[PDB]
Design a protein around this ligand. Structure first.
Ligand SMILES: Cc1cc(CCCOc2c(C)cc(-c3noc(C(F)(F)F)n3)cc2C)on1
Ligand SMILES: Cc1cc(CCCOc2c(C)cc(-c3noc(C(F)(F)F)n3)cc2C)on1
Ligand SMILES: N[C@@H](CCC(=O)N[C@@H](CS)C(=O)NCC(=O)O)C(=O)O
Ligand SMILES: N[C@@H](CCC(=O)N[C@@H](CS)C(=O)NCC(=O)O)C(=O)O
Lengths: 235, 237, 264, 235, 237, 264, 60, 264
């Protein structure tokens, strides 16, 4: 036979789970000072660098998503007692929906918002999401603004906006809490989120990043000398 | 109900698995697609596009525009090579950061032929001839034109043509080569020499620049996806 | 073959020469992605000036010497003040158009040098400060004059009155990628020993069929000297470079009062 | 009927799981001195002797692989507290890919490298691998070198190489870590790897090893007197 | 969803199981095979190949070349046997380490006939006759030619033929025999004697050497794979 | 019958006389694995000297006595300096060939002794030091002269200047396996009372269709006295042994400058 | 019995899932429906009904 | 019906007058299990003396009185010294045969008593010591004389020189089972008021088609008085009992030197 290109396809190139979020949640007695009884994470793929670099090979994309959640818990002290198995609640809050202000407010009723209840020690949680883009494709790069200042504007802040940004809130957030009440001993937990694109289409190939990322944009600050030394006539 | 027996591997998460999972947003009306120019079906299509080679990686020229230029002159030593490198598309520093190299760094095995192009950027009044040679592995790297001409080679006339192309074919003992440095799967050597010298008339520049490009052919394949070393991270936002 | 049945109702759950245009004439070309400009398909009545806007407009000439590091322009920003095209841009909420770009540079047989012209979709440039995405609208839309590249990153160390300007770098292409790979984009090479002009045809590229022409730029044009300019044994050499752009298959919609951005 | 040779086939001869690796991983508070927070194992079948001896009956082979992982954990002290169930991460690093330098570096994002997340107390993990040989078959014996010294070489170390070796790095490595943070009490764990060949073809039968192995090669050092005493005319 | 009931044996790992598992490297392009000489389909094919027998396992000759040689002379005691052993292909020290024995040590049960060959390595001027006998189990092991000739036997003429072959057929009460020592499944005895004496002329060596080989026949079978005792380990690398 | 359906898309997931050659003539043979040498199948133009390289070359004669323990050679190493075959080897990067080996040893009717000739694919030998795989290229490629076996393991106890040489043992075949099982390999027996010569035909055997002939040896030839030599009642006896090898169906590819290994 | 392998996501509760569950009141005789005016099939039908706009949202 | 599919490839995994023989003549019979003796089926040439071994041999007569508790014999042990049958037994490694057993006992009309004759396959008897399975070969193979039963268990309390002998018990049948159920085995009853002789035909029974006749006994014969002997009003009564056995369809294989067991 002759060699094939089966594994170099776009689908095969993106057929792996990649971590995008590590979130900390604690269970303990509520107190006046700040605590991590519930966490809220803004959805994005730019927190890490591997999947981001793989995606930025192209200008436009269109795909569905598969999300997997891995939960790991541990103790902190050893002179307070023990705890029973805990249940974690993960709720998706789209833009415009009310956000929690406490771990036990009405917003957790999730009458319309989808939610996942996970029992510690079971298999990692998993769900799938379709393509939810407002336009016909996702835009990894956007050369423009959301507002245009005008000569008739009273002040310069009316039309000021960030460069290369579409919306202040995109794709909503995820809120994670521990449903169980607090045991006498504190318990910490970490949730790791893994993302896998599926049914992928891409457009306008782009050269890959060559210097370390600096923020959501294309800005660069340090380490602008990637290439090393070598002789012109040296094998 | 139906009797069942649980086998090994139950309740494990393999990141490369392919199963079905419930949808959290049922009855969603997806926006239809449109015909956008520039659709890509395979990553190899990106490796078939020619890109410049940073041949000159000297200390004072690396990480600068001049690293893409090779100097040519009418008073150069005709007995010494102009440029020399090794056929390591993914590990050689001069080829690793090209588009072909960037794509290969995401894979473990590669195979296929390669295409090299050289562009001459002198004046129309300059003339000369060059010899571009490829040598399969096994023997001493060539150090003179006499040794180089025994391997594969092409003679290029600057005056008639401003660009030259040389195809390095696939010749190997193994069916696939590794993308890392390894003597058991070395590819060979590429060298350049002056066949004749560069001749210019009066009132003409005596020094000029040359550029290089590399690409893959339609018989190129890769295998065993893996993570790259060209991107790192030290802290989470 | 292996057996497979899909259980869930949702698809996501499933497992995976002379060219004349209008009243303009200029005496091989490159088509980006092999797609000619076209009007919107069958799948509010749009306005379409067939010839009042689809014609060649010439920008300001620039000078290329021994220390020039490059130039860049943004489209449709560069044509905002060109005849009725700009008026249609500022009198409508939605616009669409393709382009034909022609770069002219002439020299003698005793000169030498090479220019690279690149057309980039969604050409986003980097800033000049620690703050991220802080560049201003006025500085990001220079217009006809355009901007220039630099050989190094000059941080703007002034918190009292930040400039909020781009700081492109030649060998990083101004966006953190190596210049050698810029040939992935549609490109042309002008080598003085073979030719003296370049031509590119750009269709409309975007995630939407139509979009605003004021707050979003669809194309970027970058010109960089791949080989330095030289002439005989002279210390100083300067030659002109000219750029001419023609809109093609332009549509507008959403007529209301006129928009007047504050450019400084 | 007449006796059959069903169980003497190559497939039946290699249809059993055999241990090839025992790897130790510890979870505890990180400190300045050396620790076993993450382990890296180089892939090979020569660590043990049973499967190696069975395979060395032939010169050339071609097969796919099935890998199974069994994890066993235990405590070390009894005056520090208790711990919650732990999650183990196993990542495959092919040659040329970046290697971890800490248990929580970016390399664990596994954007492209395959990885397995295992929850303690569940069924032993399992995966399958195809034939990934560069050549047309695996070579159990290789009479040659990777470099040839030349008269024009500046020194003798340019062309020096190990006898009967192809590549310095072959098949990559496996990196194993504990995802969970450290409890106040140290916890040790061992991962045992079992390998089963499948779809086996072999060529050039070879006499089996008769003396103890000494290193990856065919060298012998001690115990060169395997046969025992017996009488010539003694039944 | 679909009701199910978990049966005993769930979530266990049996090393001899045969199930399906996910692949960690999907869409891999496997290198095609070629036709390599020497392919093997069954382990019994290795047991049908003749190999030398270390007959002489004396204290000063074991673990040495001379252990493969049996001495013959013209002045030997004609009333005493030349060699004697038992039909235990896997447990007898003189047969255990042969290829047949090595293969059998990986299995628990065996059955079939055997083939023994004897090669004479004297001069062309030497002559003589030998008697090679097999005796089924049950009675006293033979100690003289008179007892041996009552069982199965073959007469071999050295002068006419330099090699002799004797086939020991399968004769047993059980359908399969164990590969370990056990009186309930003993196989019998093999002995050799001088029919006539070895005669040589003058100016000829009076002592010579003989070699032995053993192999299996096409009616040989094994059963119940198991681990061998010929390889051990004390420390992990 | 039992029901089975494969779920995963991957196959791995699925559950399991005179002989004349060229200008040479020599007046039964054994074919290894019953496969005659052949050229590469249909599935860079190779070079093939039909007769300039496919012919019989005779090595140096050796002497067999009462204390000889054996001899060994490596192919294609032994023919590196034989006519144009060596030149083609050192002028090309890839080579392939089969062989015909002929062993000659003549005596009288009053002599006695037996020789065993074995052809071994991938014949790897053991070292002579605690260090593993430390043998050098020069010592592992003796060439025409070849090497010899020993009756015991002599450790090289010299860290100042290690020899880096093989230490084969006769009864272990030099590789840790019993000699009695060496008959698994292709073999011949020369018994002085029946015959005086041996012949073997070896095809090309390797995991690759073609491979380098300089850094890898495909075959090994081992000759060992199974029975000691003797003659009448004489104290000392010596007779010659000769070896003649003919390449067959040889191909070369990858022409470049010549390779010159440093053999001491 | 039948060999099976448990995949990720087992023993989780997704509030948007659609599975079958046993009925706690088997053999129940449901009361038949009648034709009641004002049936609604889609929520958009409610958005097509005109309603007054509180245009004047001054403080008083 | 219920649905079922087998998954695994292995079956185990699946869910669940005058009689003349040869030169002998004796003037209803019982066939054990309704199976006549036969030669081995189609599924080393066996030896088969058609008439030199298939004939009636008479054992030693025994005496039955008022205190006799029973007798037992083992086959083929009892015929080890009978003509050429024993010679064939001791000259061959494998043997096979069936039997015809005839028991003779005559009395008058004024006598009374009943005998039970039982043929037992694999008749294993108990020992006479705390040690288990310690009986010797010589004591377990009495031969023609046979053995006798006892009414109680007499332990051999002698560690200095243990006897290593059987200690059968009449009501336990010598094997730990009640005598009343011994009628499960092939059996005959000789009642003096109705008959005077018994006949049984035994085929070859074993887990193997053929087996050694020296180290294994296939059959056991047990004779026990179910009712005590009496005659008129006499204090003492004794009458003779005779046993005659004929081999049938006997085969032998594995000819070698003769076997000579050490019987004391
Ligand atoms: C490009 C690109 C694509 C994306 C992410 C789009 C998908 O965003 C989500 C995610 C990550 C999760 C949910 C979600 N739905 O349900 C749940 C829950 F049930 F787990 F809470 N999470 C919904 C959307 C639209 O971000 N950038
Ligand atoms: C001969 C011979 C064959 C081999 C081993 C080849 C297979 O090597 C592996 C192994 C052992 C594991 C993986 C692997 N793939 O995925 C994983 C993970 F997901 F578990 F991390 N491990 C991949 C290869 C090529 O070694 N010698
Ligand atoms: N060691 C640091 C960094 C931990 C961390 O989050 N590391 C990132 C990359 S900077 C990561 O992806 N780690 C691998 C993982 O934990 O999944 C810490 O523990 O705070
Ligand atoms: N007892 C030693 C040796 C342990 C060990 O690893 N033994 C090897 C063979 S030397 C082995 O395979 N043991 C069986 C197993 O633990 O799986 C130790 O505990 O360190």
């Amino acid at each position: 036979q002759r060699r094939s290109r089966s594994e170099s396809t776009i689908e095969s190139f993106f057929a792996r789970g990649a971590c995008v979020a590590i979130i900390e949640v604690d269970n303990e007695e509520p107190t006046t000072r700040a605590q991590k009884l519930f966490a809220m994470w803004r959805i994005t793929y730019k927190d890490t660098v591997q999947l981001r670099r793989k995606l930025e090979f192209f200008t436009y994309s269109r795909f569905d998503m598969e999300l997997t959640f891995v939960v790991t818990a541990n103790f902190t002290n050893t002179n307070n007692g023990h705890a029973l198995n805990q249940v974690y609640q993960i709720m998706y809050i789209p833009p415009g929906a009310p956000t929690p202000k406490s771990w036990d407010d009405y917003t957790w009723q999730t009458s319309s918002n989808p939610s996942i209840f996970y029992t510690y020690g079971a298999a990692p949680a998993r769900i799938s999401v379709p393509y939810v883009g407002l336009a016909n494709a996702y835009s990894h790069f956007y050369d423009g603004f959301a507002k245009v200042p005008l000569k008739t504007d009273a002040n310069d802040q009316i039309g000021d906006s960030l460069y290369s940004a579409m919306t202040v809130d995109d794709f909503g957030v995820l809120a994670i809490r521990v449903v169980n009440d607090h045991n006498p001993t504190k318990v910490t937990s970490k949730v790791r989120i893994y993302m896998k694109p599926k049914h992928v289409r891409v457009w306008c190939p782009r050269p890959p990043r060559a210097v370390p990322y600096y923020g959501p944009g294309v800005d660069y600050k340090d380490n602008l000398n990637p290439l090393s030394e070598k002789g012109l006539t040296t094998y | 109900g139906l009797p069942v027996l649980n086998t090994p591997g139950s309740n494990q998460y393999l990141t490369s698995d392919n199963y079905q999972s419930p949808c959290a947003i049922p009855e969603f009306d997806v926006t239809p697609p449109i015909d956008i120019p520039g659709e890509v079906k395979n990553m190899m299509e990106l490796a078939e596009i020619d890109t410049m080679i940073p041949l000159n990686l000297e200390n004072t020229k690396r990480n600068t525009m001049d690293m893409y230029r090779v100097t040519l002159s009418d008073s150069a030593d005709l007995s010494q090579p102009i440029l020399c490198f090794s056929l390591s598309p993914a590990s050689d520093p001069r080829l690793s950061h090209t588009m072909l190299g960037e794509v290969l760094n995401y894979y473990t095995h590669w195979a296929g032929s390669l295409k090299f192009t050289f562009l001459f950027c002198g004046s129309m009044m300059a003339t000369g001839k060059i010899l571009v040679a490829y040598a399969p592995p096994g023997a001493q790297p060539p150090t003179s034109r006499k040794e180089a001409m025994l391997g594969t080679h092409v003679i290029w006339d600057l005056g008639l043509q401003s660009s030259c192309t040389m195809v390095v074919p696939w010749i190997s003992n193994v069916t696939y080569r590794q993308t890392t440095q390894d003597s058991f799967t070395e590819g060979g050597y590429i060298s350049m020499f002056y066949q004749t010298r560069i001749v210019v008339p009066l009132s003409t520049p005596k020094s000029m620049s040359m550029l290089g490009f590399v690409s893959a052919c339609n018989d190129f394949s890769v295998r065993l996806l893996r993570d790259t070393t060209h991107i790192s991270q030290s802290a989470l936002p | 073959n292996y057996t497979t049945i899909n259980y869930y109702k949702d698809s996501a759950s499933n497992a995976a020469l002379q060219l004349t245009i209008g009243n303009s004439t200029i005496t091989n070309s490159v088509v980006a992605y092999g797609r000619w400009p076209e009007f919107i398909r069958d799948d509010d009545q749009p306005t379409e000036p067939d010839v009042a806007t689809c014609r060649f407009y010439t920008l300001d000439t620039v000078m290329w010497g021994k220390e020039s590091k490059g130039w860049w322009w943004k489209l449709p920003d560069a044509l905002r003040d060109m005849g009725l095209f700009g008026q249609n841009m500022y009198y409508h909420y939605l616009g669409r158009s393709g382009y034909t770009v022609h770069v002219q540079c002439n020299a003698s047989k005793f000169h030498q040098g090479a220019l690279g012209v690149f057309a980039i979709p969604e050409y986003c440039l980097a800033g000049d400060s620690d703050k991220q995405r802080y560049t201003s609208y006025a500085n990001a839309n220079p217009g006809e004059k355009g901007g220039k590249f630099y050989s190094q990153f000059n941080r703007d160390t002034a918190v009292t009155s930040p400039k909020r300007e781009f700081c492109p770098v030649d060998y990083l292409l101004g966006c953190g990628v190596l210049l050698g790979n810029a040939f992935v984009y549609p490109h042309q090479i002008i080598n003085l020993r073979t030719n003296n002009s370049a031509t590119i045809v750009l269709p409309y590229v975007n995630a939407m069929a139509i979009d605003s022409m004021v707050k979003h730029n669809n194309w970027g044009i970058a010109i960089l000297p791949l080989s330095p300019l030289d002439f005989a044994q002279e210390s100083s050499v300067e030659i002109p470079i000219t750029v001419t752009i023609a809109p093609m298959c332009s549509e507008f919609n959403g007529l209301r009062n006129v928009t007047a951005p504050k450019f400084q």
